[PDB]
Amino acid sequence: HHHMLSKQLFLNRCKDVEEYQKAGHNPWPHKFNVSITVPEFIAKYSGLEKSQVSDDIVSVAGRVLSKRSSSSALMFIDLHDSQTKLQIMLNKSAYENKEDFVSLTKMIYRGDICGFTGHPTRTKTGELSLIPISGMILSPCLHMLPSMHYGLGDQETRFRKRYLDLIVNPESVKNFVLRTKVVKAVRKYLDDKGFLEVETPILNTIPGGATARPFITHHNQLDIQMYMRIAPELYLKELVVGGINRVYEIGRLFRNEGIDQTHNPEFTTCEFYMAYADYNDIMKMTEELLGNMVKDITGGSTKLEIKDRLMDINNEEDIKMLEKFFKEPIPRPFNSAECSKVIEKHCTELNYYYDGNNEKAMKKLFADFVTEKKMVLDFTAPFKRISYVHALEEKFGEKIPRPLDGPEALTFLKKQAIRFNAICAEPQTTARVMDKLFGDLIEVDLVQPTFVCDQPQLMSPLAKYHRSEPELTERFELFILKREIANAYTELNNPIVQRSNFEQQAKDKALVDEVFLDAIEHAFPPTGGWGLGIDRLAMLLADVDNIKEVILFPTMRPEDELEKKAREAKEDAMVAQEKA
Amino acid sequence: HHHMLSKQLFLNRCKDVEEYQKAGHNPWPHKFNVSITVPEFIAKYSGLEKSQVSDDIVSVAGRVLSKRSSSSALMFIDLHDSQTKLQIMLNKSAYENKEDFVSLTKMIYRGDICGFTGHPTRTKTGELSLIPISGMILSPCLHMLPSMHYGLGDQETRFRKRYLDLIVNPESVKNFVLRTKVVKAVRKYLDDKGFLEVETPILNTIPGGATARPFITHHNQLDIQMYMRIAPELYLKELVVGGINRVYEIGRLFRNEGIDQTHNPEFTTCEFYMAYADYNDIMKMTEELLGNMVKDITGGSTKLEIKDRLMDINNEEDIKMLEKFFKEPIPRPFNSAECSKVIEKHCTELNYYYDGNNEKAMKKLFADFVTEKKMVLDFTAPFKRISYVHALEEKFGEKIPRPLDGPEALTFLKKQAIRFNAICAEPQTTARVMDKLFGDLIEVDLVQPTFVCDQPQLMSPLAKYHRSEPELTERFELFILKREIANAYTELNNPIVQRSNFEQQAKDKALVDEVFLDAIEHAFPPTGGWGLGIDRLAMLLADVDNIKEVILFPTMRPEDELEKKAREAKEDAMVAQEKA
């Protein structure tokens, strides 16, 4: 009988609560008057010396995570509030209602939400505490909370129940705080420049010309099929046509696709559009904004981070890797290395063959780095800037044949497709081969914040041509840690050309958004467009490997009961753990 | 051949643009340097006296809405920017490139986006203007803009194309500004009290126990059916269980139901939850917050509004109604009244029979009021407060039989169901009869902001019992203009009772959210819960009759071509209007 002990505990616990209620104690009182929060408490009363007790009577409340007694008249509780600890020293002599003191000191279970009213102090042991005159159960806990910490990594157990994870892994809260620090920073920056935050439809009657597979739904009264938005771009642009020069939306976007650790079915991005601005303006704006952000997380525009790349030469890095390997090991070519590495890798459910240095580097990245190697991302202005094609050309050795979409230029390009990367794919259209030639080539290293600008019209189907040098467009993509964080355009405002683009896109896909085309046919001002993924930026700044760390409730494949029975089984493996 | 003239115009206009480009003029330049906005312009240079010209050279840009010439060397343009007008006085003598002066002065079509660089001035006629040294087309308009104003009411033409409506009805922009003023006010109020703004899933794998019909969608990789959220309540509460004491979300909610002028398929609400608070705390918070809002729209906590109720006794109101009736008319009993009223009502596509005083009152409400009767909503603290049942009892004459869900109390209630309202419905369950007895009874008048508190447990399935007086719950509903604007609870935190409620709800409906139940089983702190509809509050504060006035792109039944051909037909009825 699996889950026997947990069931037993839950039932007995319910009994506890109803006997507590039977004795004239409300386990769920309506209002408890918290006079001060635990951080405020610490800020105010940390000046108290040892054995000193304040005359102030204050009242606090939080979750009990520890309950230890050195005596029947002296109990020590770790109360937690806003991810901050404060000891409650229950002394019977300093408690008014002695009867209630006994009933309460017995009733308190680990996990309970309690409130206490009494005097601040700092004990002889140095621990800042409160000596309660009174106190009560605000809400009883009916299950055994997992010990702290719990589930690291094991992302499944963590993100199945966020409400537990937040408690047993309070550090995680920081992430989400950071996340909002981001959006505030955005709002403050844009609102102060006269931007109007707006809301555009998530449900659309048109699928659109985008490739990405949308979620499909259906409205009944209208009896029409609707599609969840891929991007708010066109609506916002229609607002700019409407006469609202500066707009932005920090909205939820949806994609009916795959779920990686860098992809969630629904995610948050910000887009803004600004009349009479160009991508240069947006470049400075991006510099400024991100500067403000990382300064708001620190105080300076540089930010310390984890260096996950290991150097088989840096003996410090090697020493760190050995220290984190829960032992110590070394070799030269293989043999011993192979055995120890395969042992640890099999122990951590990792993979696979070779047992070589590559696996060592990977392990060092995904595990060791927290203990060791740091790095610094410099968000100081100005950011490094490069043109798309002259990075490629600088490095090739010389120019690319012009008419870049022509045969001669292509035939040029695969020469270095074979010479440099030794990687491509087919169909080798000019676009693809060029593109990540560029990306297993120059896209790394792009660790520091870097604008890659002036992409070819080959790469830019819906952009506006560059105002000077030919075959290029007025764009940029912001790269940090070898990834695209944000992007901007000197938006295309030619209605004729844009109609061509749209109607071509439609056929390449096989209706075209005629509404938008009408809108820009009514004259669309010169506009700067900007886009940023909030989730991914948050990932970067909180320094986390998984997108589930910055999304409170990521989309989970619901539990089929092999998962259920497994988990429940191991939780009673927990209670049997406590006893024997 | 319908739409002949519009097609002709569009084509000829495209010709105009390509001949302009052929002559060496870019109709869509990349970047124009706007040094100052039109409001900033007016703020800075309004001090200029008549015939006076500043030495300052500034550059501005916006949409041309008027193009008049008194001469071939003197032209007057109304440039519009941020819904603000500024005259451009093109004088050939004060323009450098004369060639460009002629080409440009001819090329400019009404609707174009133009930029000008020159000297501020105020003319002899008193009109603040700019005398351009140079200037250019930033983006040409390819259709004939409707005259200002256009489409009032005729909500279809308006809200089909928001980008046109914003231009020809710029006043509407105010609404949306107001709307954001609301949300900022919320954020500022909550963030300053240590609230963490968060984002919860819009896509859920569980339908829930709510009655409202959800949008249904499907994720492919997981191959599971998902449901759009009705409310974020449970997620947020799980966050409070998690240890984040104060959370809120200003999110998009979805309902797969009907589309009234007070209902949109997707709408925005704010919900917050605050540990160790009760509904009283929330009452004061609501007072404070809304006070701040209406003060931010005005400067004082009272707000002037339209009184749409007509008094067949107030001769001023009658005079107003006659003035707005595009003529003047009166009578006594009927006859003349019947004829004139039926004439005007048929003329405005209104309905229906009787031709009595009721129809007159209705018309006065929906049309006349803008010109006349005002009113003042007082958002000054404190708001009026009433208990649910003792309003009813005060007015009945005496108490209601207790055990209110019992037979005797019910049999009491329908006595006044027949005596007062002369309206009910069946099945006359205790709930329904009581409920809007109350609502065609005391729910009006509730014009001033008023908390209706302490609803019965009959009315409150998922609320927490009142801490003192029996059979009541700790709730409130905020009523303004006879409608529910916001609501709050001393949230139910009893896991046992809540499980009972949920599992009962499920059966009444015919899966139950077991996750949430687990969460609160792990002890849910005493919490205050609060909810507010942003769209509806915006409706109230902007003083508008339709929800489409506060939603940029409301959900529209796509055009079948009877609508299309009709509209296009009447737009060439427009161009034929200009000529003959």
Coordinates of N, CA and C in Angstrom, one line a residue, chain A residues 10 26 28-32 34 61-63 81-83 111 113 138-143 145 161 163-164 166-167 179-180 184 187 191 196-203 213 215-221 226 228 235 238-239 241-243 245 249 252 254 256-259 266 268 276 278 281 464-465 467 474 490 493-495 515 518-519 521-526 552-553 555 558, chain B residues 10 26 28-32 34 61-63 81-83 111 113 138-143 145 161 163-164 166-167 179-180 184 187 191 196-203 213 215-221 224 226 228 235 238-239 241-243 245 249 252 254 256-259 266 268 276 278 281 464-465 467 474 490 493-495 515 518-519 521-526 552-553 555:
Chain A
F10 N -1.9 12.9 7.1 CA -2.9 13.9 6.7 C -4.1 13.7 7.6
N26 N -9.8 28.6 17.5 CA -10.0 28.7 16.0 C -8.7 28.6 15.3
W28 N -8.3 28.9 12.2 CA -8.2 29.9 11.1 C -8.9 31.2 11.5
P29 N -8.2 31.9 12.4 CA -8.8 33.3 12.8 C -8.9 34.2 11.6
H30 N -9.8 35.2 11.7 CA -10.1 36.0 10.6 C -9.0 37.1 10.3
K31 N -8.7 37.8 11.3 CA -7.7 38.9 11.2 C -6.7 38.9 12.3
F32 N -5.4 38.8 12.0 CA -4.3 39.0 12.9 C -3.6 40.3 12.6
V34 N -0.6 42.2 12.1 CA 0.8 42.3 12.0 C 1.3 43.8 12.0
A61 N 4.1 37.8 12.0 CA 3.5 36.5 11.5 C 4.2 35.9 10.3
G62 N 4.3 34.6 10.3 CA 4.9 33.9 9.2 C 4.8 32.4 9.3
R63 N 5.6 31.7 8.6 CA 5.6 30.2 8.6 C 6.6 29.6 9.5
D81 N 9.3 34.9 7.0 CA 8.4 35.9 6.4 C 9.3 36.7 5.4
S82 N 8.7 36.8 4.2 CA 9.4 37.4 3.0 C 10.8 36.8 2.9
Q83 N 10.9 35.5 2.9 CA 12.1 34.7 2.8 C 13.2 35.2 3.8
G111 N 5.4 24.0 9.6 CA 4.7 24.4 8.4 C 3.6 25.3 8.7
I113 N 1.3 28.5 9.9 CA 1.3 29.9 9.8 C 0.9 30.5 11.2
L138 N -2.5 30.8 13.0 CA -3.2 31.5 12.0 C -3.7 30.5 10.9
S139 N -2.9 29.5 10.6 CA -3.4 28.5 9.6 C -2.5 27.2 9.8
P140 N -3.1 26.1 10.1 CA -2.4 24.9 10.4 C -2.0 24.2 9.1
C141 N -0.8 23.5 9.1 CA -0.3 22.8 7.9 C -0.6 21.3 8.1
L142 N -1.2 20.7 7.0 CA -1.8 19.4 7.1 C -0.9 18.3 6.5
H143 N 0.2 18.6 5.9 CA 1.2 17.7 5.4 C 2.6 17.9 5.9
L145 N 6.0 19.1 5.3 CA 6.9 19.9 4.4 C 8.2 19.2 4.1
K161 N 5.0 21.6 -8.2 CA 4.4 22.3 -7.1 C 5.2 23.6 -6.8
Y163 N 4.3 26.2 -5.2 CA 4.0 26.7 -3.9 C 4.9 26.1 -2.8
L164 N 5.3 24.8 -3.0 CA 6.3 24.2 -2.1 C 7.7 24.6 -2.4
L166 N 8.8 27.4 -3.6 CA 9.1 28.7 -3.1 C 9.5 28.7 -1.7
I167 N 8.8 27.8 -0.9 CA 9.1 27.7 0.5 C 10.4 27.1 0.8
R179 N 12.7 39.7 -12.3 CA 11.9 39.7 -13.5 C 11.1 41.0 -13.5
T180 N 10.4 41.3 -12.4 CA 9.6 42.4 -12.4 C 10.4 43.7 -12.4
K184 N 9.4 46.9 -14.8 CA 9.3 48.2 -14.2 C 10.3 49.1 -14.9
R187 N 8.9 50.0 -18.2 CA 7.8 51.0 -18.1 C 8.3 52.4 -17.8
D191 N 7.5 55.2 -20.3 CA 6.4 56.1 -19.9 C 7.0 57.5 -19.7
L196 N 2.7 55.6 -24.7 CA 1.4 55.1 -24.2 C 1.4 53.5 -24.2
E197 N 1.4 52.9 -23.0 CA 1.2 51.5 -22.9 C -0.2 51.1 -23.3
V198 N -0.3 50.1 -24.1 CA -1.7 49.7 -24.6 C -1.9 48.2 -24.6
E199 N -3.1 47.8 -24.9 CA -3.4 46.3 -25.0 C -4.0 46.0 -26.3
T200 N -3.5 45.1 -27.0 CA -4.0 44.6 -28.3 C -4.5 43.2 -28.2
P201 N -5.4 42.8 -29.2 CA -6.0 41.5 -29.1 C -5.1 40.3 -29.0
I202 N -5.4 39.4 -28.1 CA -4.7 38.1 -28.1 C -5.4 37.1 -29.0
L203 N -6.7 37.3 -29.1 CA -7.5 36.5 -30.0 C -7.7 37.2 -31.4
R213 N 3.5 28.0 -35.8 CA 2.2 27.4 -35.6 C 1.5 28.0 -34.4
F215 N -1.9 28.6 -31.6 CA -3.0 27.9 -31.0 C -4.3 28.3 -31.7
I216 N -5.1 27.3 -31.9 CA -6.4 27.5 -32.6 C -7.5 27.3 -31.6
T217 N -8.4 28.3 -31.5 CA -9.6 28.2 -30.7 C -10.8 28.6 -31.5
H218 N -12.0 28.6 -30.8 CA -13.2 28.9 -31.5 C -14.2 29.6 -30.6
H219 N -14.8 30.7 -31.2 CA -15.8 31.5 -30.5 C -17.2 31.0 -31.0
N220 N -18.1 30.8 -30.1 CA -19.3 30.1 -30.4 C -20.5 31.0 -30.9
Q221 N -20.8 32.1 -30.2 CA -21.8 32.9 -30.7 C -21.6 33.4 -32.1
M226 N -10.8 31.2 -34.2 CA -9.9 32.3 -33.9 C -8.5 31.8 -33.6
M228 N -4.6 32.5 -31.6 CA -3.9 33.3 -30.6 C -2.7 34.0 -31.2
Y235 N -0.9 45.6 -35.0 CA -1.9 46.4 -34.2 C -1.3 47.7 -33.8
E238 N -0.7 50.0 -36.4 CA -1.9 50.7 -36.8 C -2.2 51.8 -35.9
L239 N -1.8 51.7 -34.6 CA -1.9 52.7 -33.6 C -1.1 53.9 -34.0
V241 N -0.1 54.7 -37.1 CA -0.9 55.3 -38.2 C -2.0 56.1 -37.6
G242 N -2.7 55.7 -36.5 CA -3.8 56.4 -35.9 C -3.5 57.7 -35.3
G243 N -2.2 58.0 -35.0 CA -1.8 59.2 -34.5 C -1.2 59.2 -33.1
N245 N 1.9 58.5 -31.6 CA 3.3 58.5 -32.1 C 4.2 57.4 -31.3
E249 N 3.6 47.6 -25.8 CA 2.9 46.6 -25.1 C 3.9 45.5 -24.5
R252 N 1.6 38.9 -23.5 CA 1.7 37.5 -23.6 C 1.6 37.0 -25.0
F254 N 2.0 33.6 -27.8 CA 1.7 32.2 -27.7 C 2.2 31.4 -28.9
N256 N 2.2 27.4 -30.5 CA 1.8 26.0 -30.4 C 2.9 25.1 -31.0
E257 N 4.0 25.0 -30.3 CA 5.2 24.3 -30.8 C 5.8 23.4 -29.7
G258 N 7.1 23.5 -29.6 CA 7.8 22.6 -28.6 C 8.2 23.2 -27.3
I259 N 8.4 22.4 -26.3 CA 8.8 22.9 -25.0 C 10.2 22.5 -24.6
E266 N 3.6 29.8 -23.7 CA 3.3 31.2 -23.6 C 4.4 31.9 -22.9
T268 N 6.4 36.1 -22.4 CA 6.2 37.6 -22.3 C 7.2 38.4 -23.1
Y276 N 9.1 58.8 -36.1 CA 10.2 59.7 -36.4 C 11.5 59.3 -35.8
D278 N 14.8 56.2 -35.9 CA 15.4 55.2 -36.7 C 16.1 54.2 -35.8
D281 N 18.7 55.6 -33.2 CA 18.0 56.0 -32.0 C 17.6 54.9 -31.0
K464 N 13.3 47.6 -44.2 CA 13.5 48.7 -45.1 C 14.9 48.8 -45.6
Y465 N 15.2 49.0 -46.9 CA 16.5 49.0 -47.4 C 17.4 50.1 -46.7
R467 N 19.9 53.1 -46.2 CA 19.8 54.4 -46.8 C 21.0 54.8 -47.6
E474 N 18.2 48.4 -42.8 CA 18.3 49.1 -41.6 C 17.8 48.3 -40.4
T490 N 14.3 50.3 -38.7 CA 13.7 51.5 -39.2 C 12.5 51.0 -40.1
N493 N 7.6 51.4 -44.4 CA 6.4 52.2 -44.4 C 5.9 52.4 -45.8
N494 N 6.5 51.7 -46.8 CA 6.1 51.8 -48.1 C 5.0 50.7 -48.4
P495 N 3.7 51.2 -48.5 CA 2.5 50.4 -48.6 C 2.6 49.5 -49.9
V515 N -6.4 44.5 -43.7 CA -6.6 45.6 -42.8 C -5.4 46.4 -42.6
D518 N -4.3 48.4 -45.6 CA -5.2 49.6 -45.7 C -4.6 50.7 -44.8
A519 N -4.4 50.3 -43.6 CA -3.9 51.2 -42.6 C -2.6 52.0 -43.1
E521 N -1.6 52.1 -46.1 CA -1.9 52.8 -47.3 C -2.4 54.2 -47.0
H522 N -3.0 54.4 -45.8 CA -3.3 55.7 -45.3 C -2.1 56.5 -44.7
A523 N -0.9 56.2 -45.1 CA 0.3 56.9 -44.7 C 0.8 56.5 -43.3
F524 N 1.9 55.7 -43.3 CA 2.5 55.3 -42.0 C 3.8 56.0 -41.8
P525 N 3.9 56.8 -40.7 CA 5.0 57.7 -40.5 C 6.3 56.9 -40.4
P526 N 7.5 57.6 -40.7 CA 8.8 57.0 -40.4 C 8.8 56.5 -38.9
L552 N 6.7 31.3 -13.2 CA 6.1 30.8 -12.0 C 5.4 29.4 -12.2
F553 N 4.6 29.3 -13.3 CA 3.9 28.1 -13.6 C 4.1 27.7 -15.0
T555 N 4.3 25.4 -18.4 CA 3.4 24.4 -18.9 C 3.9 23.0 -18.7
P558 N 0.5 17.0 -17.9 CA -0.2 16.5 -16.7 C 0.2 15.1 -16.2
Chain B
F10 N -7.1 55.7 -55.7 CA -5.9 55.0 -55.2 C -4.9 54.8 -56.2
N26 N 12.4 61.2 -52.6 CA 12.0 60.0 -51.8 C 10.7 60.3 -51.0
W28 N 9.4 58.3 -48.9 CA 9.6 57.6 -47.6 C 11.0 57.8 -47.1
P29 N 11.4 59.0 -46.8 CA 12.8 59.2 -46.2 C 13.0 58.4 -44.9
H30 N 14.2 58.0 -44.6 CA 14.5 57.1 -43.5 C 14.4 57.8 -42.1
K31 N 15.0 58.9 -41.9 CA 15.0 59.6 -40.7 C 14.9 61.1 -40.8
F32 N 13.8 61.7 -40.2 CA 13.6 63.1 -40.1 C 13.8 63.5 -38.7
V34 N 12.9 65.4 -35.8 CA 12.0 66.3 -35.1 C 12.6 66.8 -33.8
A61 N 6.9 67.5 -37.1 CA 6.4 66.6 -38.1 C 5.0 66.0 -37.6
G62 N 4.1 65.8 -38.5 CA 2.8 65.3 -38.2 C 2.0 65.1 -39.5
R63 N 0.7 65.0 -39.3 CA -0.2 64.6 -40.4 C -1.0 65.9 -40.9
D81 N -0.3 66.7 -34.6 CA 0.6 65.8 -33.8 C 0.2 65.7 -32.4
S82 N 0.1 64.5 -31.9 CA -0.4 64.2 -30.5 C -1.7 64.9 -30.3
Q83 N -2.6 64.7 -31.3 CA -4.0 65.2 -31.3 C -4.0 66.8 -31.1
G111 N -3.7 64.3 -45.6 CA -3.4 63.0 -45.0 C -2.0 62.6 -44.9
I113 N 2.0 62.6 -44.1 CA 2.9 62.8 -43.0 C 4.0 63.7 -43.5
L138 N 7.1 62.9 -45.6 CA 7.7 61.8 -44.8 C 7.0 60.5 -45.1
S139 N 5.7 60.6 -45.4 CA 4.9 59.4 -45.9 C 3.6 59.9 -46.6
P140 N 3.4 59.5 -47.8 CA 2.2 60.0 -48.6 C 1.0 59.1 -48.3
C141 N -0.2 59.8 -48.3 CA -1.4 59.1 -48.0 C -2.1 58.7 -49.4
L142 N -2.5 57.5 -49.5 CA -3.0 57.0 -50.8 C -4.5 56.8 -50.9
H143 N -5.2 57.2 -49.9 CA -6.7 57.2 -49.9 C -7.2 58.6 -49.4
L145 N -9.0 60.5 -46.8 CA -9.4 60.5 -45.4 C -10.8 61.1 -45.3
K161 N -12.2 50.2 -38.3 CA -10.9 50.8 -38.6 C -10.5 51.8 -37.5
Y163 N -7.6 52.8 -36.7 CA -6.5 53.7 -37.2 C -7.1 55.0 -37.9
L164 N -8.3 54.9 -38.5 CA -8.9 56.0 -39.1 C -9.6 56.8 -38.0
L166 N -9.2 57.1 -34.8 CA -8.3 57.9 -34.0 C -7.9 59.2 -34.6
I167 N -7.7 59.2 -35.9 CA -7.4 60.4 -36.6 C -8.6 61.4 -36.7
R179 N -7.4 55.2 -19.5 CA -7.3 53.8 -19.2 C -5.9 53.5 -18.6
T180 N -4.9 54.0 -19.2 CA -3.6 53.6 -18.7 C -3.3 54.4 -17.4
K184 N -1.6 52.5 -14.2 CA -0.4 53.1 -13.5 C -0.8 53.3 -12.1
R187 N -0.7 50.1 -10.2 CA 0.7 49.6 -10.0 C 1.4 50.5 -8.9
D191 N 2.7 48.5 -5.8 CA 4.1 48.4 -5.8 C 4.7 49.1 -4.6
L196 N 4.3 42.3 -5.3 CA 5.0 41.7 -6.4 C 4.0 41.5 -7.6
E197 N 4.2 42.3 -8.6 CA 3.4 42.0 -9.8 C 3.9 40.7 -10.5
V198 N 3.0 39.8 -10.8 CA 3.4 38.5 -11.4 C 2.6 38.1 -12.6
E199 N 3.0 37.1 -13.3 CA 2.2 36.6 -14.5 C 1.9 35.1 -14.3
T200 N 0.6 34.8 -14.4 CA 0.1 33.4 -14.2 C -0.3 32.9 -15.6
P201 N -0.5 31.5 -15.7 CA -0.8 30.9 -17.0 C -2.2 31.4 -17.6
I202 N -2.2 31.7 -18.8 CA -3.5 32.0 -19.5 C -4.0 30.7 -20.1
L203 N -3.1 29.8 -20.5 CA -3.4 28.4 -20.9 C -3.4 27.4 -19.7
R213 N -18.4 29.7 -19.8 CA -17.9 28.9 -20.8 C -16.5 29.4 -21.3
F215 N -12.8 29.5 -23.7 CA -12.3 29.2 -25.0 C -11.5 27.9 -24.9
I216 N -11.7 27.0 -25.8 CA -11.0 25.7 -25.8 C -10.0 25.7 -27.0
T217 N -8.7 25.3 -26.6 CA -7.7 25.2 -27.6 C -6.9 23.8 -27.4
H218 N -5.9 23.6 -28.2 CA -5.2 22.4 -28.2 C -3.7 22.5 -28.4
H219 N -2.9 21.9 -27.6 CA -1.4 21.9 -27.8 C -1.1 20.6 -28.4
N220 N -0.2 20.7 -29.5 CA 0.0 19.5 -30.3 C 1.1 18.5 -29.9
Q221 N 2.3 19.1 -29.5 CA 3.4 18.2 -29.1 C 2.9 17.4 -27.8
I224 N -2.6 17.7 -25.9 CA -3.6 17.8 -24.9 C -4.5 19.0 -25.1
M226 N -6.4 22.3 -24.0 CA -6.1 23.3 -23.0 C -7.3 24.4 -23.0
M228 N -8.5 28.5 -21.9 CA -8.1 29.8 -21.5 C -8.7 30.2 -20.2
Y235 N -4.0 30.5 -8.8 CA -2.5 30.6 -9.0 C -1.9 31.6 -8.0
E238 N -1.9 30.4 -4.6 CA -0.8 29.4 -4.4 C 0.5 30.1 -4.2
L239 N 0.7 31.3 -4.8 CA 1.8 32.1 -4.6 C 1.9 32.6 -3.1
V241 N 0.5 31.0 -0.6 CA 0.9 29.8 0.1 C 2.5 29.7 0.0
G242 N 3.0 30.0 -1.1 CA 4.4 29.9 -1.4 C 5.3 30.8 -0.6
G243 N 4.8 31.8 0.0 CA 5.5 32.7 0.9 C 5.7 34.1 0.3
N245 N 3.9 37.1 0.3 CA 2.7 37.7 1.0 C 1.8 38.6 0.2
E249 N -1.9 40.7 -10.2 CA -1.8 40.5 -11.6 C -2.8 41.4 -12.3
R252 N -5.2 39.6 -18.8 CA -6.2 39.4 -19.7 C -7.0 38.1 -19.4
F254 N -10.6 35.7 -20.4 CA -11.3 35.3 -21.6 C -12.6 34.6 -21.3
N256 N -15.8 32.7 -23.5 CA -16.4 32.3 -24.8 C -17.9 32.4 -24.7
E257 N -18.4 33.6 -24.7 CA -19.8 33.9 -24.5 C -20.4 34.9 -25.4
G258 N -21.1 35.9 -24.9 CA -21.8 36.9 -25.8 C -21.0 38.2 -25.8
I259 N -21.3 39.0 -26.9 CA -20.7 40.3 -27.1 C -21.7 41.4 -27.0
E266 N -12.4 39.1 -24.7 CA -11.3 39.2 -23.8 C -11.2 40.6 -23.1
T268 N -9.6 43.0 -19.4 CA -8.5 43.1 -18.5 C -9.0 43.4 -17.1
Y276 N -2.5 38.4 5.8 CA -2.8 39.0 7.1 C -3.6 40.3 7.0
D278 N -7.7 41.7 6.0 CA -9.1 41.4 5.9 C -9.9 42.3 5.0
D281 N -9.6 46.1 5.7 CA -8.3 46.7 5.2 C -8.5 47.0 3.7
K464 N -15.7 33.1 3.3 CA -15.5 32.7 4.7 C -16.6 33.3 5.6
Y465 N -17.1 32.5 6.5 CA -18.2 33.0 7.4 C -17.8 34.2 8.1
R467 N -17.2 36.7 11.2 CA -16.6 36.4 12.4 C -17.5 36.7 13.6
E474 N -17.8 37.4 5.2 CA -16.9 38.5 5.2 C -16.6 38.9 3.7
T490 N -12.4 38.3 2.8 CA -11.5 37.7 3.8 C -11.4 36.2 3.4
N493 N -9.7 30.0 3.9 CA -8.4 29.3 4.0 C -8.5 28.0 4.7
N494 N -9.7 27.6 5.0 CA -10.0 26.2 5.6 C -10.0 25.2 4.5
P495 N -8.9 24.3 4.4 CA -8.7 23.4 3.3 C -9.8 22.3 3.3
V515 N -4.7 20.3 -7.3 CA -3.4 21.0 -7.0 C -3.6 22.1 -6.0
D518 N -4.3 20.9 -2.6 CA -3.0 20.5 -2.0 C -2.3 21.7 -1.4
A519 N -2.2 22.7 -2.2 CA -1.5 23.9 -1.8 C -2.1 24.5 -0.5
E521 N -3.8 22.9 1.6 CA -3.7 21.9 2.6 C -2.4 22.1 3.3
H522 N -1.4 22.7 2.6 CA -0.1 23.0 3.2 C -0.1 24.3 4.0
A523 N -1.3 24.8 4.4 CA -1.5 26.0 5.2 C -1.5 27.3 4.4
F524 N -2.7 27.8 4.2 CA -2.9 29.1 3.5 C -3.1 30.2 4.5
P525 N -2.2 31.2 4.6 CA -2.3 32.3 5.6 C -3.6 33.1 5.5
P526 N -4.1 33.7 6.6 CA -5.2 34.7 6.5 C -4.9 35.7 5.4
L552 N -9.1 49.2 -27.7 CA -8.6 49.7 -29.0 C -9.2 48.8 -30.2
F553 N -9.1 47.5 -30.0 CA -9.5 46.6 -31.1 C -10.5 45.5 -30.6
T555 N -13.6 42.8 -30.4 CA -13.7 41.6 -31.3 C -14.9 41.8 -32.3

